[PDB]
From a paper:
The in situ structure of the portal protein within the procapsid was determined by localised reconstruction of portal-containing vertices to a resolution of 3.7 Å by averaging around the 12-fold symmetric axis. The in situ structure of the portal protein differs from the crystal structure globally, in changes in domain positions, and locally, in conformational changes such as the inversion of the tunnel loop. In the in situ structure, the C-terminal Crown domain (residues 377–436) is shifted upwards away from the main body by ∼5 Å, and twisted by ∼13° around the central axis. The Wing domain pivots ∼8° downwards, towards the Clip. The tunnel diameter at its most constricted part is wider by ∼8 Å. Hydrophobic residues V325 and I330 are no longer exposed to the tunnel as they are in the crystal structure and are replaced by polar residues Q326 and N329 due to inversion in the tunnel loop conformation. Residues 330–335, which protrude into the tunnel and are part of the longest helix in the crystal structure, instead adopt an extended loop conformation in situ, facilitating the tunnel loop remodelling. These modifications alter the shape and surface properties of the tunnel, which widens and changes from hydrophobic to hydrophilic (compare Figure 2E,F). Movement of the Crown creates space between the Wing and Crown, which allows remodelling of tunnel loops, facilitated by an unfolding of a 5-residue segment of the long helix (residues 331–335) within the Wing domain. The unique conformation of the portal in situ demonstrates that the capsid plays a role determining portal conformation, allowing DNA to pass through the tunnel, whilst the portal has the ability to modulate packaging activity and slippage by switching its tunnel properties so that it can engage and disengage with DNA.
Numbering used by the authors:
A (entry chain A): 337 to 436
B (entry chain A): 26 to 224
C (entry chain A): 26 to 436
D (entry chain A): 113 to 436
The structure:
Amino acid sequence: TQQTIISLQREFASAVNLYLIPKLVLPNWPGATRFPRLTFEMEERNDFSAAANLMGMLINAVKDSEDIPTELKALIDALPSKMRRALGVVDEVREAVRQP
Amino acid sequence: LEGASVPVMSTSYDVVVDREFDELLQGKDGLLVYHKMLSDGTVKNALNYIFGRIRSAKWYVEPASTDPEDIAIAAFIHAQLGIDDASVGKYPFGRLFAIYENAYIYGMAAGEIVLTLGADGKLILDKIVPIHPFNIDEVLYDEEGGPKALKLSGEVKGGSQFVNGLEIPIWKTVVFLHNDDGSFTGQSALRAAVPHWLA
Amino acid sequence: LEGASVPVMSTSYDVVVDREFDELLQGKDGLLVYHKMLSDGTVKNALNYIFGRIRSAKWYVEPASTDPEDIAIAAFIHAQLGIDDASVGKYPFGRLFAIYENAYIYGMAAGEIVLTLGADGKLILDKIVPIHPFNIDEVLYDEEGGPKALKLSGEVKGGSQFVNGLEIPIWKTVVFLHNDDGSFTGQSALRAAVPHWLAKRALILLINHGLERFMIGVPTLTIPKSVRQGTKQWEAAKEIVKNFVQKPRHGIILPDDWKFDTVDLKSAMPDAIPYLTYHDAGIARALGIDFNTVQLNMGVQAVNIGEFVSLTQQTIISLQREFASAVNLYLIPKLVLPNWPGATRFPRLTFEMEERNDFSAAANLMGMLINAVKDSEDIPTELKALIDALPSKMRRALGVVDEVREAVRQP
Amino acid sequence: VGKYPFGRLFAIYENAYIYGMAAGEIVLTLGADGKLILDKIVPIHPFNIDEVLYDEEGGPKALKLSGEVKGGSQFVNGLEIPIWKTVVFLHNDDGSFTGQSALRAAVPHWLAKRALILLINHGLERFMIGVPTLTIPKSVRQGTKQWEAAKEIVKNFVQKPRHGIILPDDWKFDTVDLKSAMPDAIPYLTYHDAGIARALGIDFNTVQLNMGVQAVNIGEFVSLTQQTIISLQREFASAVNLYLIPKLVLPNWPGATRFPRLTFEMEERNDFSAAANLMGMLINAVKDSEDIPTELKALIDALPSKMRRALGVVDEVREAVRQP
């Protein structure tokens, strides 16, 4: 059922991205050639306690520094993408495409 | 090369005509069976679970590049769709889910794209109305086998009009298909569960 | 040497002709059986799972070398295919999946390659239209046994044209085959699941004929010879039998000569459920999938540890390898060579070898890594030096990707 | 660019696994660099092979072929091909050049399986609807209206078992009493299916045949199907290394005496967490040093070969033989 529910979302996203999006972008931007795409987040039910232990190791690394939050966020966005997704922190791209 | 000299051919044979071989499920009579299978506990349970799990997929607009023009048009069409649940546009994104679930049950469903002019000079997506496949008689086709237009004949609610033969081009519409063979013929997903249901 | 003096010979014998021995599955009549088997719950379930698992393989274009020309043409054909889901080219890559699933069901499927001229002087891949094997009559052949051209005769949708005998060369097309013998003859994958399916249908009809006997019972009624057909007593006996079938509450009222009875079969109904599960197991075993994914595990033991791989995992790897081999042999040289005649090592299409490992092991490893970085002043750059100093398998397991794929996708 | 010859070897090997003996051609065109490039390899199906010739010392000499070109073009007959242009694969060869097929032991179980399926198909038609019998007096003969009426009664008992039976007081409709229940033939089917899968040399967990029998507790040093799949790879690699490689190296290097060999990697599914803990100990050792990566790689290639393979880092030999 997980592969079924992924395969249906991919068909829905493909149909939207092929038919709805070019009928919206091109009447408002004729010079467009690479349309923005619709994609879901690849969910993965992982343990919160592993993320909790990882975050504890992170604040153990930050603990000797004076300024906690900015050096902490430097350590956060210095992480690889999968672990950064697993902590639940999102990038600036999605918050810059939603809130403005 | 010049172009596609090969037309989009039918999936038809002497018995199998347009992905179907049973005469009971041949034309719009198969749509009656597909609608009557919604009265099953198992079928409606599986459809409610699958469609509810589709509706909570955490969708996000991904832009083309990191250029501010791509981010601008991505946020534009994000405001047009409203991935965040509500907006002023009367929620068009769940109408896409309704059209998709009709296309999952029946094989082919469609909807209109209403583009009024926004106040900022941009073509706002105003509304999307569904088109139920009971009201669709045929779909027109180009000479190269691809589709051309949609032929509609239904009934306006309240018994107002009996619309007949209304032909609608594709470039004003969106068409959803389940397990398309690349030839624009949508077989329904309830096909294999028919004989077990009858038995 | 001069060349191949040995032609590509047929797989034919006196009974076996072109990988087939059954006359029912001999020509295009076998395509009818292969299409009718799509109405099965088990077959459509296994095909939906296998094809959906193919469509989420995390494909990536691998270039030839680290030279910028190879990376340039790799990103070129990546833009031509659109491994990232959508593009302006109307998604040709899922049409390849449609052609491949038709070739998996029927044994041989094909599609066209439309090459319009792009604005940058490059031959853009415009569209790919499928060719369903119902419309394919024959395939032509060279004198050395290899194929030459494709003979087509089908029907344009809308009833517009009845195209007949349209011959198409191969160098404009792509041809997919399942389990090819190297001789260009694609046997279908649904071949072994045919007899179990036929016996399954016959057994369902036997159960439908048997329950009507064992659940209501066939009535019999003995009358004297004075009553003949078309009489009032004959109609009364018809009414008694019809009321025993339809309305079994009006009861039976007989004269003292008539003996109403049910025909004593004198045996209980045999349990046909194990035979149904046996033929369903035959179908799902012929498809090459375990009984846990398709819901057929019924009272049999679960897998203890398994082998180095699973059954369905090896099946889904072996199909992806055939698909990637067919793409890399037929589509890619028809795209690179018209835009670079001086190319000799084509960029390849390969999926990522997935491996479900524990995130907590990667979390503990990353904790050890930041313990190593902790004494240093500048965290991120020395951290990334420690990251790309790792071996390739652990670096893949952390989920960080190299610069090659992000340099072949985003530019 | 060579149109993938290596999977053609797999096709020839699977034909030789099914049939016992398969072969293929070696086309050697001249490359632009003066080297004999391997151009293509075409398979030879064993339906098209009539005989194989032999030397006077018992060894093989040439291959006699007679088949049909596809498209109905030519009927090739008696085409004799020497061995030094070809490659020949054999399954479980006795050293005497005679390849017995691998499907040999699974033949009688398959034949008994088919006969048992036909016995079940003849038995269910008796035990599920019941054969009807009907006794009439001698006054009724064939072709009469009463004879057609009795035919109609029997046909309605078979086909439409709801019209009922209406008889005169002399006729005795009955089902023939077999007086025994149907025996369970499912264990015999599973027995012959177990015979087939046992003759193929594979465990009952990979092929879905584990039905009520116990799972493997610990197993041996290897498994059944693991040893089977190793032993087939060794035969394939031996056949390639004996026949294909000397026909490629010696026409391009006559002075060669030790050919490069084809060998697979000995896979071993081990825990990643043990490798993760080992790598954590390694970076704990590197942590006090200033320059992390070069001293780290010195510690990496200072390791023994098995642990270095287990970390997934490869040597410079394979990356120097593949990428250049």
